[PDB]
Structures are given as structure tokens and as C-alpha cells.
Design an enzyme around this catalytic site. Sequence first.
Site, mmCIF file in Angstrom:
data_model
loop_
_atom_site.group_PDB
_atom_site.id
_atom_site.type_symbol
_atom_site.label_atom_id
_atom_site.label_comp_id
_atom_site.label_asym_id
_atom_site.label_seq_id
_atom_site.Cartn_x
_atom_site.Cartn_y
_atom_site.Cartn_z
ATOM 1 C CG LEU H 39 -1.786 -1.248 1.392
ATOM 2 C CD1 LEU H 39 -2.754 -1.077 2.552
ATOM 3 C CD2 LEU H 39 -2.529 -1.557 0.102
ATOM 4 C CG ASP H 40 -0.274 4.558 -2.648
ATOM 5 O OD1 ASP H 40 -1.183 3.705 -2.703
ATOM 6 O OD2 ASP H 40 -0.448 5.759 -2.940
ATOM 7 C CB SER H 41 0.999 8.095 0.935
ATOM 8 O OG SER H 41 1.095 8.426 -0.440
ATOM 9 C CG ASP H 43 -3.511 2.174 -1.396
ATOM 10 O OD1 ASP H 43 -4.617 2.513 -1.865
ATOM 11 O OD2 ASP H 43 -2.629 1.609 -2.071
#
Lengths: 182, 108, 78, 178, 168, 62, 153, 85, 128, 459, 119
Positions: H39-41, H43
Site C-alpha cells: 500500500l502507498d500513502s 492507501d
Amino acid sequence: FSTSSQLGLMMVTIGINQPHLAFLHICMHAFFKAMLFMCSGSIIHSLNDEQDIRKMGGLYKAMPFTTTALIIGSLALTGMPYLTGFYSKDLIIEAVNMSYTNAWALLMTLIATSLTAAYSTRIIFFAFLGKPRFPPLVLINENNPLLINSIKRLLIGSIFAGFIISNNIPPMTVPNTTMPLY
Amino acid sequence: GYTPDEKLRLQQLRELRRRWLKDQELSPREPVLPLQDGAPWVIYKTYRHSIFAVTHVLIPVWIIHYYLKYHVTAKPYTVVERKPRIFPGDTILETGEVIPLMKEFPDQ
Amino acid sequence: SKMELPDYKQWKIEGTPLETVQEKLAARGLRDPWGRNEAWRYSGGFANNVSFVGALLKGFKWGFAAFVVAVGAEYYLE
Amino acid sequence: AFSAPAAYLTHQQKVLRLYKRALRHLESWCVHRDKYRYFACLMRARFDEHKNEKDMVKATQLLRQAEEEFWYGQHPQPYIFPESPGGTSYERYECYKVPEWCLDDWHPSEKAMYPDYFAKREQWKRLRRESWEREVKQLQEETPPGGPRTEALPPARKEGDLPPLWWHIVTRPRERPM
Amino acid sequence: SWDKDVYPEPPRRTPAPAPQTSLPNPVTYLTKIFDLLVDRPVTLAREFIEQQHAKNRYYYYHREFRRVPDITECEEKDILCMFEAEMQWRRDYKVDQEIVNIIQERLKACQQREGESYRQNCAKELEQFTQVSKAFQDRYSDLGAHYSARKCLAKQKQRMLAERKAAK
Amino acid sequence: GVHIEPRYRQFPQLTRSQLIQAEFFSATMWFWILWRFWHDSDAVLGHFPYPDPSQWTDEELG
Amino acid sequence: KDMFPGPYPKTPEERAAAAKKYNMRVEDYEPYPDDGMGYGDYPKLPDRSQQERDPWYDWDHPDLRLNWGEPIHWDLDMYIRNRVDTSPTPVSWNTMCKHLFGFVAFMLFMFWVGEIYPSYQPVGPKQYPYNDLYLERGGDPTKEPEPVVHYEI
Amino acid sequence: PPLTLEAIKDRVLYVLKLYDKIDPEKLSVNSHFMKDLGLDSLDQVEIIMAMEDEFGFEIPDIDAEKLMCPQEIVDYIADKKDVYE
Amino acid sequence: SFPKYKPSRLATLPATLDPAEYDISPETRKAQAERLAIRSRLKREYLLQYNDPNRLGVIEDPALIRWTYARSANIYPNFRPTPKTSLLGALFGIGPLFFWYYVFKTDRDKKEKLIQEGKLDQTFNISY
Amino acid sequence: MLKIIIPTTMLLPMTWMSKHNMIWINATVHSLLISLISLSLLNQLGENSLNFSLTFFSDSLSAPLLVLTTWLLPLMLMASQSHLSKETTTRKKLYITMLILLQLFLIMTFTATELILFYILFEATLVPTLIIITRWGNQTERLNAGLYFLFYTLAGSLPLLVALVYIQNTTGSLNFLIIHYWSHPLSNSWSNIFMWLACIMAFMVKMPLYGLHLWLPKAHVEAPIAGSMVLAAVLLKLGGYGMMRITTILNPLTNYMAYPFLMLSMWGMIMTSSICLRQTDLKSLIAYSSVSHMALVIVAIMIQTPWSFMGATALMIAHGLTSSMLFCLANTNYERVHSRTMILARGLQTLLPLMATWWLMASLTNLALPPSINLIGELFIITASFSWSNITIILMGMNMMITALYSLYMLITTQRGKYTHHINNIKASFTRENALMALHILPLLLLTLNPKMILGPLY
Amino acid sequence: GAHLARRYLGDASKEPDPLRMPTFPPDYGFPERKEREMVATQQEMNDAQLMLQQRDYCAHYLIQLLKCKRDSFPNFLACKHEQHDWDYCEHLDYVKRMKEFERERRLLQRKKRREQREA
């Protein structure tokens, strides 16, 4: 805001020089508006202090008794015939039409009645109808004797009080017997 | 994200806070200091109901009626009642009577 | 009496409007990853709700039946 | 429980806050879940489109324009969580919250009604009274010569030492005191 | 025990009960229940208290003040005669206030009693109060907080001089 | 004491009395409306008439 | 004591000393204009309501959204959360004033128009017996009223 | 509504498992979204929003950004709701 | 190009819509760090006294003392009769008094004139 | 009147010869008994005053004020016990002696039959009040406040002394009965105008008039609790009593000369009620509210109508009680937190519940919730002014609204919100403080049942 | 509401003025008009405490209705016929007032026709 609008309608009735009808409207509004606010309180308690309609949905079956009480109250508020509202608001409107009146006042009152129907529909549609939008944990429980009985008394009053009060009270205004059908 | 110092500090505070919350829990004993009324079974069914009825309605009604006896007689005009409506009917005091013409055309 | 959460697998976008939303997003090349979490709202007993007219006409069937019976009583008795 | 603030908000943090605000206001406008999901995926795509812009000037201008769009498109009555600031229930139970120091002024008869609790309270008082000196020493040692340049406080370095300035956080009134 | 002449009440005309329906009247049964539960005990209690009062009956008297020379017959700076006359004037002021009060009480009782016909059937009482109010206003109005017999005399003299000028 | 157990993601448990009472009251409302409308109709009490004839009021015509 | 507010700063050293006294940066510190109104040394802080301050931050005084040792605005009592609020609004202030005042003016003007053209029904004046209830309406009984006669249509 | 610690953990894992991007099998209390998962930011922002919607309480942004773990979310919810068991 | 938000005195400009929040320089970041330093020092002192197990009483905030003094005591010492101060004082002190004198005197004179001309109704005004 | 005077004088030897432990107890007991004796004076013949002797008389105006003073003395002792505990026995006895001398002077002022004796006793009250303020105040500004109070009052009074001597020379007597009975009308001449000014201005100063009220905030803020109580309850009312008494002499010129003071009071009531909205000190706010109510009283006196006078008397009594209670309530918080800043102590309702109810009742009386005697007086004054000019309603109604706003703002700020976290010295309210508040409140609520007692002679 | 349409949008002179009504004298046209007959006596109205607004030409039916209501109580549904009688009388009076309005309309048009005749 509905209560404020109804107060404005009563003030209009006073302006039309029809005071006793204003008192009758006070009496009936007491019943149905109190029941409506109690139903809103029940919804708020079930949904953990949530009062935004956007976060309330699909409560028609979740809370049958509150839904019935709100439906009856909204119908009475909107002037459904032969409910408490019909005996007060319908006469108020008919008297306003059948009298010397400021034109804009009469137009505004009719539009206000339409908007009353509008916001009753708003509450019913957003809260009771649709799909549930409240948080996952479901605590809906209207099975409390106090809540059910308290709403029951006001429901019976909303349904039947207008007929009883209107019939029993002595006639205090000359009726607007004949008028155009529209 | 958390700095290592932030994580350690928050976890220590978590332990202390949970300990405080558990300490706030009450024990099985909450000593209440220990019969002015000797009525142990007072009929909950009706004795309370009739007692409430008498005390709240019956006594005040007696007192208010006695006050009506006091105030009406003591001062004139204290209680004034709207004159009862008189239609074409008999009156108790003088037994008078009248009819309303009735010349009105009956059909409607 | 400890509460038991339902099985997470049961929730599905199929058979719900979320599937139509997903079809549109796929049409535009986007995918929604939270559909299953919102599925419970559109599933189960919550799935079916009455219309505004249906809500207004609650008990109208039994009320009309009672009206018919009472009108029969009134007309027959006289 | 709130973390100490930083002097400035990084561009990433500002973008994240804008994203959260936009999503919440969109949910306010999009009352029904399905429409919300569709337009929320649209918003995520919108952010992803310029996720990787190399020029910081261009990204800053984009953030500025996005904030202007947000102000035009903000919901006049955005949904507020019931207990959040501006919420219907925000601070509703504040009056019921009572400070711990009040119990010290209880009459001895009142304290008698709850003996075990006050014994435990005396234990906690002893812990605080012992820990204060070491906490002050640790705060002095860790503090830079100029002074504390952030609100963050160090954790307990050694066993037997409580986190510095721990009393009020640990003993804060319960959220729903009743 | 109030005097009817001082406090007039029109004779009471109460229509006789003329039921036209079979249904029992709730008011009748509720009133009988009230009589039995409340009125009889109250009447017995008042009977007992009145017996107790009769056992030791004592009387109180209404003081009579002999008329004293008015301010008009009091010489200048004659503080004894001025004091007597001013006290008499103040007593008369209170008495005239009470007279106005009695007439106003008649007015209100008539407004209540007549009902929706108050405008026409209360005309006589309203005329009585109009006369009394005009007299009271002329005699005592505008004297001020420090009202005195001398100031009322001065107002009367001013009125009489104005009347002579009207005579021309 | 758990009469209605909170259900995490399912329709709340509804006691039969709730449904029965709500249905009864709604049916009573509808019955009252129909009954009053059948017995008494507020529609009109004599069509709003127009006095066309001139001789009825005035027909001088000069 | 030097901690107490003092006269308007004129020399730069006085400005630095005032900034130190009020626990502010020298650049941030701006005195009220020296016009003889009594403000003197007190800082002229931004005119922001306490509502505007971040709710989430752990303020020293939570209700007032204030911190110990922070310079206190001259009009803090005016700007407390209960009292005036200056927080930014969804719509521009000028637009809100124009819309509200226009609505009120239009409503009053339309009411005047309604008074000019008042609605009524196509009916004649109500007729009352006994000379329009002259006696019932309080007319003088002794003085015979001017007769009012209503005839059948 | 006691809202015990185990209930909070179970509900957080429920929300995360119903999250399509996270593969359910490898999801764990200590699975950092940034590192262990992919997951990224944004997310992170979405998951924090999902949690606050699930529990009905808003996590302030300054605290929200720093969670970075499910167990962190669970403990923060416990701290906010005063769950001591 | 959505319509811009005109800030006003009772509608402050949102930080999001602040033209300066997007033009940051090294000096601005340095200043922000210094402001945080000041705040952190003040909060450290406060929390140290606030968590002291021996402290019993108020933690005298010098800022509050300064605010009260500036709002009460310091006013006259730092007041100078000036054109603005003098004119505003004249207007707001004596202006309203003469306006109310004009109003009440005119009303009273009219009433007295009507009374003199016997053209005022006091039929039942018997309680002044 | 010696039935009251002589025991009050004997209070001093008892206090001086009492044991160190028993000073407060004896003083309170015997002061309460004296107050009980004073209740006999309330029985007033409607037509004439109670002329006990050549020197002393009582009427329906003096009686309530005398009862108020006698009642106030024990409440003052109860309030002053706490902060004088550390003081030595001799100083405590001197403080009690100052209070007793003040009561004696006030009683003789209210019952005095000669205007010159009234002047001597009315000015004599300055010395004990000045000593109290400047010796037992807790701030460096107590001396400046004492100077302001003394010099404002003396600058007002001395021309009054000259005018009274001139009246004695011309009319021949300063006895109130003779003055009332003879009372030749004044003429509109500059000399008579200045005589009117000389007579009025001293009482105008005593009753804080806008532009001459500056002494009141300083003195009330800087004085000890007992001194503030006397100043608010009784010392201000001396001006109203004298102005009502003195107005007999100046009959016709009062219409012409009233307008400046009438306008000043009417606008100043609004100005001071607005001032209360933005005050940062509780005592100062209470003082400005006192100023506004006394402005209402001044309007009532200047209008010179019977209803206005009845309202003035009722308002004087009600305000004395309410302002004294408010000062005591503020003093309790000051003792606990040792500051008069309103913001510093917050959310006290949670910490001290019953004191919150005391505050609520005091504020409700301050905002004139009916059927409070405050409302009775204010309403009668308002009706009299409406008769004076229908336009008066606007300012009076605005003042009522502002009074409600500031009273409930004080209540909300002090007693509502979250408690100030750092303050840890709040302790359970003592029985003494609650008893003082109850002794303040109960007589005020009871007086509503029989309001003819405080409605004055014109009733 | 259409009569308002004629009154305002159209020629005002042709349409009657409600306040001014009735401008034309009763004698004009209508060769013989009988006086409206009031069955209820003035003393009867005063004794019954009828409201002044309700003291109209239909007062007798109202008196009968009030008496029937008083006698029938507790039953409050027993006066439907008397209520209908009073309502019908009010309807007749309202129709009469409408006829007065129409008469004024036609008379004004005839007056305008005379003015047309001059030209």
C-alpha cells in the site's frame, strides 16, 4: 424548521383574523410535532447519537414502530385528510384563500405547504427508505415499553384527537361553506 | 510514522493508562453505612398507588376547596363565572321560557 | 454471549449496485477496492426496502379490509 | 494522545490532508454509497494522474488550484462525526469529567465507602511521588542546551523509570465518566 | 358577607337541564363523586372550625375619624392645623383610591360575567368608571411624588380660575 | 440480560410485538381515513354558483 | 516589574525587549500603532477567533484553545468560541450580505405589492342585522342610529 | 457495547480483509502497510478513513498518518475509547 | 476557474486559499522552526509545573497578568490627547447625550403643547 | 430609635472586651438580635411617619434601609471572618469596630430628622469605609481608590453643606417635617439653579452617576469583601435616600434641571451595561452593573412620580441584596484561586455544585426575573418613564437585554465550560459561605410575597 | 382569482371595488326588494352570547345548533342535521353576496355603456 414554519402559519391565521383556528392548530401541532421529535430521538439513540440523515438509511424495517409513527406524523403535518392536520391546516388554508389578504402572503403560504410536504419527504426518504448507511455495528432496538407506549399515546392522539376536539368545541367562526372546487 | 522513541513512550503510557483504568474498577464490596419505615411487605400492587392518589390529589383538592370557601366568601368578585348561555328554554330560578319565532322557512 | 462477526468471505459485490459501479469503473479502467466492505449494506434483509408510496401505504390492505367489514356492518344493520 | 506537531507540513502531508478532506466532502455530497464509491475512485485516479510530477513548482501550483476547487466545491454542511469537533456530541460529557485531585478533598466518611479504591490511589500517588525526581533528571539530560525544540517527550530509558511527565496523560478523566 | 349594593351582581339565570339523549352525562357522575369525596369532608371540617370559632367569639371595630378643619381654613405656617388637615387629606386620598378600585372591580366582573356581549351589557359600569376616573384624575393627577393638600388646593384654584375665564 | 443481541452486519432482531403494534396502528390510521371519507366527504357543500340572469339583479338596459 | 506591559517601543532594542517579554519572535512582534489609544507595548496579534485554532491540538487550556505563555489577543474575550467567530465561511462575505439583504428587500417589496393588489373573493360585504349591530357593537342606545337597511337579492 | 480489545482487533482485521488491494492471507496485526504490504500513502489515507467510518470516531490527521500498522490502529482506538482489556 | 473567495474581517482567508502558503522560502521555514521552539519551551515549563506532585495552586501565567494589566492599567499611562482620540471621544461621549436630549425634549414639548391645547387623551390615565 | 442605636453602640464594648476566640460569635449573635429588633420599624402608619423623637423619625423609606443595614452587618462579619483569621486580635477588633461604627452612622443617617445631622452622619461614613479600604485591602491600588472615593464624595458634599446652611438661614429650619409642610416653590433664577445643583450633586456622586462613577469601580475592586458589601448595599443607597428627601425643596426647577442628569443616567445605563460585557474582572463587572441599576434609580428619582419613587425604593433594596451576594460569590472564588480574572477559574459548577446554584439565583435576580423585587422596581420605574416619554422604552429595554446578557455571560464563563486543569486548590465550599449566600438570597425571595414593605412611602 | 385578473389586468372601472361596494343604490333596478328578515331577536342573540361576527342573518340556525349541542352531550355526533341547516343558511348568504358582486359588475358596465352612448 418545520415547527418554525408551522408557527408562521399560525401567525398567518392570526393575521387573517381567525384566532380560534390558530389555537386549534396549536393544539394539533403539539401532538404530531412532539411525536415526530420523539421518533427522531429514537433514531438517534439507536444509531449512537447520530443525527445526520445522510448516515441514516434503511430504517423502515429495522424500526417498524418508529417508522409507522413518523409516517403518520408526517401525513398529519402535511394535511392528510381526516387526520389531526386536516382539521386545522386545511381550514387555515381555505380561510386564507377565502378572505381579503395580501397576495404575496397567500402565495407564500401555499408554497410553504408544498415545502412542508417536501421536507417530510426528505426525512422519510433519506432515513427510513433506501439502504442502511449507518456504521456497521447494529444496535437498533426499539423494544422498550416506555418508548413504545409514549409514542403510542401520541399516535392515537394524532389520528383521532382532531375529530374529537373539532366536534366537541363550540363553533367559533362562520364557516366558509361554499367555495370554488380548486 | 512513529519514531522509535515515540513508539516506546506511547506503549509505556498505554500500559500505565490500562493499569489506571483497571484500578478504577470497583471491588465486590462498596460499603454502605446501614429502617425508619417498618413496612416490609406496603402492598407494592395498590398501597403505593392509593397512598399516592390520596396524598397528591385528595389532600390538595380538599385544601383548595376549603380555600375556595375562604376566598369566595371573604372577598366579593374573587370568583366570577361567565353568565350561562340561555336558549329558548326554562330557567331554574324564575322558570321563564321563550321560543325563537320559528317563522323560519323549514325546507332547506 | 460474546458477539461473533460474520464470515468476511460471504460479502460480495455480485447482485448489488456496487457491481454496476465496478462495471463502469472497469469501463474507464479504474478498480474500486472497497466494494466488499460496503456490500453488507446492500445484502441480506437490508437488500429490499419499500418505495415512498409503499411506505405511505403501510397497513392500507388491512385498513381497507376493516373499512369493508365496517361498511358492511353499517349498511346491513340498517 | 495527540502527537506533537511539526513546524511545517510536508507537501506529501498537505496532499494527504487535501485528499481526506475531498473524500469526506464528496461523501457528504454523495449520500449513497455506490455513487460515493464511483466518484471516490474518480478522485483517486485524479490524484494518481499527477502523483509522479517531477517539478515541485508544478506540483505546488496543482495543489493550490486543487485547494481552490475544494473551497468552491466544499459541502456547505459537511458531515461531522458525532464526537468530532463541530459534531453534535463534541464535549457533551465534559462536565461529567472530573479531575482526580478532587478525590483528595473527600470527607473521610466518603472515602470509607470505597476503601480498596483509595488504597490503590495511595499506591499510585506513591509511584508518582517517587518518579518525579528521576523524570526531571531525565528531561534535563535529554533536553538540548538551547532548550526543547519540539514538544515530543522521551520514553523511559531504563527499567523502573516511568515516562517523563506521565501523570496527567495516564490519569486523564475517562471519555464517558458518568 | 359583602354588601350587594356596594358590590352589585345581576340576578343569576341558569338554564334548567334538558337532556335530549340517552347516553349518561359524565359531568353529572363526576360532580357527584366530587361532592362525596371532597365537598362533604370539606364541609364537615369547616363545620368543626366554625363551631370552634363560635365557642370563643370576639369582635373587632372599624375606627371612626372625626372630620377636622381643612387646609383652606388653616392659616399660613400653622403647623398644627396644617398637620391635621394634611393627614385628613391623605386619608381621603386613600379612600378615593379605594372607591376607584371598587368601581374597577365592578368593571372587570361585568366584563367576565356578560361574556361575548360585554361591549353592550357593560356600558353602565364603564360609564360609572369613566366618571370616577375623570374625577380622580382631576383631583389628584399630576400632583407628583410629594403630593400635599396645599398642592391639590392650588390645582383646584387653577381649575376654578380657568373656569371663570371660560365664563369670560 | 440480552433481549436483542447486537448483530454486527445483519438485520437487527425484531420482536414480534414491535411489528404487530406498528401494523395495527398504521392500519388503524388507514381505516380511519377511509371510514371518515366514506361517512363524511368534505369535497363541497353546494357548487360555487354564478348568478348569470341580469333580470335577477338588475336589467334596466336604459 | 519589566514583565508588565509598557510604553510603545520606539528604539529597535525596545522592540526586541518587548518581543522577549511577550514570548514572541522580534520579527513577529508588531505593536499597535502609537495613536494615544492606550495599547502601548501590547502585541497586535492577528484578528482570528479562537474557533479558527486547530481543535485537534492539545492546547494548555482546551476550552479557550490557548496555551500557557502564549501572547493573549487584546480582544480575546470578544473572540472566544462562545462570542464572535471569524472563521472562513463557505461563501464570500460580500456575496452573503448581498444575497440576504436582497432577499429581505425583495420580500418586503413583494409584500408592498401584495398590499397594492390584495387578494379577495368575488363577494359583497357581509350584512348584519339591526343596523349592523350598532347597539351590540357599543353604539349609543339613546341616540337613534342612522338606519342601515339590507335588502334581499 | 463493551468494545473489548479483541473486538477492536477483529473488526480492524475485518475491514482490512475486505480491502481488495490487501491479500487476505498475508494480512497480519504486524503487517506494516507501507513495507510488508504494498500500500502507498493514499492507501494509508483510505484505510484510516475506512477504520474511522467503521468505528464512527475520527482519527486526527496528525495521528492518522503515523499508524502504519493494524496493531497501531487497534491500540490507538483502544486509547481513544478507553479500552483496558 | 471557480469564483474566488473574498476574505473579509469576519471571514478570514482559509489557509488552503492562502497565497503565501505555496510560496515558501528557507527563511520562512527557519522562522516556523523558531516559533515551534518558543512554543515547545513554554509547553515544557508549563507541563513541568503542571505535573509536579508538590505543586498546589494555580500556575500563574504571566501572559494572563499582562493581558489584564494592558486592558485595565496601562491604558491611561499610554494615552496622549490626539486629534483622533479627542474627536472620537467628543463624538462618542457627548454626541449621544445631545441626540437623546433633542429627542426627549422635542417629544416632551409636543406632549406639553397637546396637553395645554386640551388635545390629548388621558381618559383613564390615572396612574402616573 | 434608641432601641436599635444603644445596642449597636454596646456592640463595641462587647467586641473589645470579648475573648480572642469569641469575637466573631458574639458580634454575629448580637448583630442578628439587633436586626430582629429593627423589624419592628417596618410597621408604618400610612398617613404619617413614626416620629420617635425630635432628632429621629422613620418612614416607609428609612425603615427598609435600616433593616437592610442591620441585616448586612452579620453577613459582613461572616464574610470577613476568613481573610482576617491571620490578623492579630486587636486588628480584628478594630475591623469589627469600624463595621459597627459604620452601622451606627448609617442608622442615624436614615433616622435623622434634620438635614444638617443627616449630612454630618452621611459624610461621617467616609472615615470607617476609607479606613477599611485603605488598611485591609489586598492591592497597592487600595490607597488610590480610597483617595478617589473620599475626594469625589467630599467635593460633592461640601457645596451641599453650604446650601443646607443657607436653607437654615432662609427658611429657618432644616427639619424634614417642617420643610415638607412649608416647602415654598423655587424660582427659575441662576442662584436657585445653583442651589439645586448643590443639593443634588452630592447624592448624584454617592449614587454612581455616569461621569461621576469612576470612584465606584476602583473602590469596589480594591476594597475588602465587607467594604464592597456595604458600599454596594447601603452606601450607594444613601444618595437615593437623600435625593428623595431633598427633592421636596426643589419643586419647579427639577423639571428644567432634570434633563442633563436624566439623559446622562439613561445613556450611561446602556454604556455601563455594555462595559460589563467586555470586563475582564468579576468585581469590576459587578460594580458596573451596580452603576447601571443606580442609574435606573436616578431616573426614577428625577422623574418625581409616585410609581417611580416606589420602584426606586424597591430597586434600592433589591439591588443592595443582589450586589452584596454577587460580591460574596466572587470573593469565594478569589479566596480559592487568589485572582479576580474571570477567565482564570472556569467550569466551577462541576467542582462546586451548590455555589453554582447560588450564582444562578443571584444572576437571575440581577437580570430581573419576575416576580423578583428587582423586576418590580425596574418595571415600576419603566412604566413611570414611559409616562414621562414613550421613547424611554427603547433605552430601558436595551438596558434590560444587555443586563441579561452580561449576567448570564458571567454565569457561563465562571461556572461553565471545562475546569481549569492546573488549578488544584478548589476545595469543598464551607458551610459559612453557603450560609452567607442563603442569608442573602432567602430574604430577597421572601420579600416578593409581601412587597409593600419595600415599596416605600408613596405606596 | 380570475375576478382579480379582470380587476387588475383589465379595466378597473368595469370591475367592482370590494371596499367601495355597493356604490349603486338599492333602488336602481330591482323594482321591489324586501328587507332581509332576521328570525333571531336581538335579546335572544345577547342571551345566547353569540359572537358579534356570528350574529348574522343566519343566527337562528346557530342558536338551534348550540342548544342541540348542549342537550345532546355527551354525544357530539347528534347535531349533524342542525349543522347542515346552519351551513346551508350561510351558503345562501354567501350566494347572495356573490349576486351583489355580479350586480355591481353589470351596473358598472351599464354605466360605462351610457358614457359610450354619449360618444
